[PDB]
């Protein structure tokens, strides 16, 4: 009568994945690609060279999770007891097992996450040692690494553990990290309340995102719309193939058999890189500057003129353009669907500007001709939506992304260990060697 | 000296060689479309093994001569690189100079660089407080990674990037941060080694006229003239382990995180998190345990046959001879030989039975392993000797051998990070696929 818990459901699908892996391994010698000089000097761009199970980017329909579109996930995944949005814990279930959980399975997993959320005293002390001006992503990376004192994998490996069993402690550590990371993030957000936020008991009947909101100081019925935003945000950003730096660094460090705490810490150190991590922040700044210029009662024409002027000036429209995706990011559209049912969001001029830009900017960018596949990505909307709900320190938008992006890389780490994938170790060459 | 021809500092010497590297990069870029290999299913499921897919300037593994630094063998480095004011071994500071610039520094340039490192060796108070928060059982490599990441509060690159900085200038703050990290890391490592003395070791003033290894030894509690042989071992160890191509996890993770424009503190922290992985990090420790177990079994007065018999029994049992074997290198690791050359001038090392056993194994094990036929290129690597040499000098907590490797392995990856920024290399971003996509 009792439904399988997540560990049982994972164990049931391990044999089929190992069988599929065995079939692929028989074709080891088969050639699938070429390596060119471009790939070596160009950061391996386009080189199909690592495994990632849970998500694959479809050039038309965007990111798919085990073949499911964002829309399929929004229809199929269990929701909270209140609210309209899919749960990140349900997305984690799907990523890990390939299967949609029942509502009751999700409720039991949420209860586990709440119960495992507490931090050891040394983590609270560690966090209190950080200077106030330490960058929030540096704080988050360090704290996550420091939780390796609690690693079951590290201890089991040292004691002696069969290869075939490496996945179990990896799974236990991953759930532990997931339970804890929202609380660590909230301590980064509220450095003066370490003692209180660091020990506060979570409501075991509520979902992971709700409890994260509570730790952020945005709990209770008055913040229910924000709860739904946060649920959606965390679900949407959970995984996006293995190539991005946070996913890849997690896998890389993981592949040397560093435990999930150390491995996702490395992921977060990569996420701290300014080059692509600040897109949501940049979009927000750009939208607010546009509002400053064109005011709060603006026409379609005003928007179009503003976009042309930006482009003619040699500036970019942030949050637009992609190497391969030929349509709007379905993650973007999911945020727009969230907004469409909330009259106060639709009344916000900042949001209206995001919406108008999404209707006008792609045609403008195409005609201008400089930007490949000029459609909105998720960063076009996420910052503005957080800003609307009072979360107006953009610097911390990366922290919330770091919480979300634990989901997919941890799933892949579990599978890496289940399948027995080896250390990641490419071969380097010097420029003289390419000449 | 402040003349017309006054000897360049490291940053000036680097600046002088940047234009030629950018020109060589331009020439390589014209060949972008040239095919240099194949990708197979093996490469995707096998952690990219053998896939030539990243750039690393400073070191290239030669199948005959072993690891070379800008074409120079370990023997060339031992002859050409400047030594300490006392001592017979090449300085890791000089190795760093060579890796970075492609050039052998003068003794005077090395002395000035050592002084810069000594002057920057102090830590901010919050780093000492952070280290004091660590539980005593926290793994030493977790401690080291965290403390290095926490030094990003001092990053010039992070602050300059945020303020606005030309792409052509990214290398300068990267260089400044890298030197800062190098100066500080031995002190951080010593705090990991001595958790009861954080306040003292953490603030102790260093002799600014001493070299980087000497100051590290001093912070470890092994300073003074009585430890001069250990100083030379440590110099050699740190110089030898500084760089070994880009593929190893510490080098690669540094480059990967660095490629998203995270500063050198955050990037080498990621390197150290990878170094903390037990799978391939613990070889020096395994060799030490194996040698000591062998000595236990065969004693100190043994025949060549006894050694051979011990090796055959190990192999027939299905166990490995650690510290032996390589995929590509067809001779003893030249790093191994450099450790043996160190030993050859120290009569107390040569008198140590544990060292004699390392030497005897290197003369007997290769033939045995070849005949057994299971281990490719069955020659000793550097791990065959490093742990025993430390053990001889009283550095007998093998768990901490990885920490000393972490200090050494700052050198090469930081150099490559500086070059990545000088060249404007993009984010590392390969493409993934699922098993279903390989089954088709």
């Amino acid at each position: 009568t009792a439904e399988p818990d997540l560990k049982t459901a994972l164990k049931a699908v391990i044999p089929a994945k190992r069988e599929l892996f065995k079939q692929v391994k028989e074709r080891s010698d088969e050639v699938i690609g070429e390596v060119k000089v471009a790939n070596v000097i160009g950061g391996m761009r386009g080189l199909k060279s690592m495994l990632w199970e849970g998500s694959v980017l479809d050039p038309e329909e965007g990111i798919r999770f085990h073949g499911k579109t964002i829309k399929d996930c929004q229809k199929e995944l269990p929701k909270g007891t209140s609210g309209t949005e899919m749960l990140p814990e349900a997305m984690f279930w799907l990523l890990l097992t390939g299967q949609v959980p029942s509502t009751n399975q999700v409720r039991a997993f949420s209860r586990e996450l709440a119960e495992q959320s507490h931090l050891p005293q040394h983590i609270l002390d560690l966090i209190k040692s950080f200077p106030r001006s330490m960058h929030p992503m540096t704080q988050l990376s360090i704290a996550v690494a420091a939780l390796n004192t609690e690693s079951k994998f590290a201890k089991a490996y040292e004691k002696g553990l069969s290869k075939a069993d490496y996945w179990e402690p990896t799974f236990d550590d991953s759930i532990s990290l997931l339970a804890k990371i929202p609380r660590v993030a909230a301590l980064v957000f509220r450095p003066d309340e370490v003692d209180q936020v660091g020990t506060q008991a979570l409501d075991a009947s509520q979902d992971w995102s709700y409890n994260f909101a509570e730790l952020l100081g945005k709990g209770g019925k008055e913040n229910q719309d924000f709860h739904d935003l946060l649920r959606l945000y965390l679900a949407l950003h959970g995984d996006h193939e293995g190539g991005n730096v946070s996913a890849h660094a997690t896998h890389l460090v993981g592949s040397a058999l560093s435990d999930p705490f150390l491995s996702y810490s490395a992921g977060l150190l990569g996420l701290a890189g300014p080059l692509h991590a600040l897109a949501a922040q940049e979009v927000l700044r750009w939208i607010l500057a546009m509002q400053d210029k064109i005011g709060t009662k603006f026409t379609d024409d005003d928007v179009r003129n503003y976009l042309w002027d930006t482009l003619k000036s040699g500036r970019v429209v942030p949050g637009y353009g992609h190497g391969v995706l030929r349509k709007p990011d379905p993650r973007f559209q999911a945020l727009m669907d969230f907004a469409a049912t909330r009259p106060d969001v639709l009344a916000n001029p900042v949001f209206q500007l995001v919406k108008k830009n999404s209707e006008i900017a792609p045609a403008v960018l195409t005609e201008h001709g400089k930007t490949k596949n000029p459609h909105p990505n998720v960063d076009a909307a996420s910052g503005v939506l957080f800003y609307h709900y009072g979360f107006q320190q953009p610097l911390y938008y990366t922290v919330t992304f770091g919480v979300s992006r634990a989901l997919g890389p941890l799933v892949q780490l579990i599978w890496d260990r289940a399948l027995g994938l080896p250390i990641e170790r490419p071969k380097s060459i010097n420029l003289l060697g390419l000449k």
Side-chain angles (χ1 to χ4, degrees), chain A residues 38-337:
Chain A
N39 301 123
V40 175
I41 63 173
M44 312 177 178
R45 201 220 284 172
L47 195 65
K48 188 154 270 196
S49 56
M50 60 175 306
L51 216 49
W52 201 266
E53 290 298 280
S55 53
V56 176
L57 178 63
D58 180 324
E60 256 298 309
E61 291 290 326
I63 194 75
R64 290 181 180 264
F65 305 122
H66 296 287
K68 301 189 186 290
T69 60
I70 297 305
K71 280 178 180 124
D72 295 331
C73 292
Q74 290 186 295
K75 177 179 191 177
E76 295 171 54
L77 296 185
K79 325 295 181 84
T81 53
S82 280
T84 57
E85 302 297 325
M86 64 179 172
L87 296 186
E89 47 268 73
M91 180 65 75
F92 186 82
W93 192 291
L94 172 65
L95 292 164
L96 184 60
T97 68
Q99 300 162 339
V100 176
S102 74
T103 288
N104 283 350
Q105 286 173 312
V106 179
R107 293 289 180 267
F109 183 41
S110 298
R111 175 171 297 282
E112 295 169 41
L113 292 168
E115 288 185 4
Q116 290 177 231
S117 68
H118 289 278
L119 301 165
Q121 185 65 45
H122 71 90
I123 299 295
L124 299 181
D125 295 342
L126 174 97
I127 290 165
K128 284 183 180 175
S129 82
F130 298 156
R132 220 35 86 81
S133 66
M134 178 184 275
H135 191 283
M137 290 297 318
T138 300
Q139 297 185 34
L140 182 66
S141 307
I142 285 169
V144 166
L147 284 168
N148 132 290
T149 55
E150 313 310 296
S151 179
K152 296 184 174 179
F153 183 82
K155 296 183 190 81
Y157 186 88
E158 206 269 346
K159 274 152 209 64
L161 170 77
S162 289
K163 283 213 70 192
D165 299 329
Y166 285 179
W167 75 268
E168 294 195 51
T170 301
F171 171 93
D172 292 342
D173 285 349
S174 294
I175 298 316
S176 172
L177 176 48
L178 276 183
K180 294 170 174 64
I181 195 167
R183 186 186 299 270
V184 177
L187 293 173
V188 173
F189 196 68
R190 303 170 67 178
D192 298 312
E193 315 182 64
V194 176
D195 296 331
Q196 199 270 291
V197 172
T199 55
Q200 178 189 326
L202 302 184
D203 185 340
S205 69
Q206 284 287 6
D207 60 282
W208 193 57
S209 306
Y210 179 96
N211 286 334
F212 185 26
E214 170 60 46
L215 291 174
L216 294 167
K218 288 187 139 299
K221 292 218 191 214
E222 47 268 293
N223 292 302
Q224 273 173 332
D225 286 307
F226 177 74
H227 304 153
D228 259 345
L229 172 68
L230 183 61
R231 284 165 188 138
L232 181 60
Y233 175 93
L234 293 173
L236 293 174
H237 291 84
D239 205 39
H240 201 284
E241 300 194 325
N244 64 85
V245 187
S246 58
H248 183 194
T250 304
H251 170 73
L252 173 58
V253 169
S255 79
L257 302 181
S258 288
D259 59 73
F261 299 100
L262 306 185
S263 299
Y264 194 55
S265 177
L268 294 164
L269 294 171
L271 188 55
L275 187 50
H276 296 120
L278 304 186
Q281 291 87 335
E282 190 188 354
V283 168
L284 180 62
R285 176 195 323 115
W286 187 90
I287 289 287
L288 292 170
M290 181 173 192
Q291 176 180 53
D292 197 49
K293 190 70 163 166
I294 72 172
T296 197
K297 219 180 185 48
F298 52 82
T299 74
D300 286 359
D301 213 47
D302 287 333
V303 170
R304 190 154 21 237
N305 288 337
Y306 190 89
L307 286 157
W308 274 111
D309 289 352
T310 303
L311 292 170
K312 294 187 191 167
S313 294
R315 294 178 232 120
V316 292
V317 183
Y320 283 74
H322 206 275
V324 303
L325 185 55
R326 317 277 305 178
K327 292 271 165 76
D329 182 357
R331 295 173 311 164
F332 168 85
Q333 187 53 42
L335 296 180
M336 307 302 288
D337 299 337

Side-chain angles (χ1 to χ4, degrees), chain A residues 325-394:
Chain A
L325 185 55
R326 317 277 305 178
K327 292 271 165 76
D329 182 357
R331 295 173 311 164
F332 168 85
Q333 187 53 42
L335 296 180
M336 307 302 288
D337 299 337
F338 161 89
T341 58
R342 267 96 193 165
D344 63 311
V345 174
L346 298 174
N348 194 330
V350 184
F351 180 77
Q352 283 160 15
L353 220 31
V354 171
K355 185 175 199 290
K356 283 273 205 208
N357 214 68
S358 78
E359 290 154 358
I360 292 165
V364 174
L365 290 160
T366 297
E367 190 176 351
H368 179 73
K370 310 304 183 207
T371 312
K372 203 180 181 197
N373 302 302
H375 305 291
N377 65 53
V378 67
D379 301 327
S382 65
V384 164
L385 287 170
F386 283 142
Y387 185 87
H388 169 85
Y389 285 108
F391 215 57
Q392 298 181 1
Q393 287 168 312

